[PDB]
C-alpha cells in the first residue's frame, strides 16, 4: 500500500509498504530513496515516535496515512 | 438503463448501467469516459453519498435518475 512521509520542511515522499513491515523496514526504504541513515530518522504517527521493531499494523497505520519524519543526530 | 451524472459545474454525462452494478462500477465507467480516478469521485443520490460496494438497486436508483458527482482529493 501507499503511505506518505512528510518532513519538517514540508516535503512529502511517497512509500510503497506493507502493514507487516517494521518501522525499521520503512526507515530502510527512506534510506534507499533519500540517503538518510535509519539512525538519523525519527518517524512519528498519531503524535508519537514509532519504535523500530514494531509494525505498521501494530500502530494501525492505514493506506494513505501520513507519517512525520524528523531528523536527528547520533547513532 | 440510462442514468445521468451531473457535476458542480452543471455538466451532465450520460451513463448506460444496470441496477445490479455497484457504485464502484459506475465510478469505473466515469473513469472510462472522463478520466477521473474513482478515488477522486463522490457520487450522491437522494441527498446522500453512495457507498462503493452497494448497488444502484440497493439505493433504488431508477431509469433516468440523476446522480450528483463531486470531486475530491486523496486516495
Curated annotation (Swiss-Prot), chains A, B:
The record marks 54, 72 as: Interacts with activating enzyme. The modification Phosphoserine is found at residue 65. It is found in: Cytoplasm; Nucleus; Mitochondrion outer membrane. It is a peripheral membrane protein. Residues 1-75 form the Ubiquitin-like domain. The modification (Microbial infection) ADP-ribosylthreonine is found at residue 66. Changing residue 68 to G: Loss of DTX3L-mediated polyubiquitination of histone H3 and H4. Phosphorylated at Ser-65 by PINK1 during mitophagy. Phosphorylated ubiquitin specifically binds and activates parkin (PRKN), triggering mitophagy. Phosphorylation does not affect E1-mediated E2 charging of ubiquitin but affects discharging of E2 enzymes to form polyubiquitin chains. It also affects deubiquitination by deubiquitinase enzymes such as USP30. The record marks 68 as: Essential for function. It comes from the Eukaryota. Exists either covalently attached to another protein, or free (unanchored). When covalently bound, it is conjugated to target proteins via an isopeptide bond either as a monomer (monoubiquitin), a polymer linked via different Lys residues of the ubiquitin (polyubiquitin chains) or a linear polymer linked via the initiator Met of the ubiquitin (linear polyubiquitin chains). This is Ubiquitin. The chain holds residues 1 to 75 of 229 of the full protein.
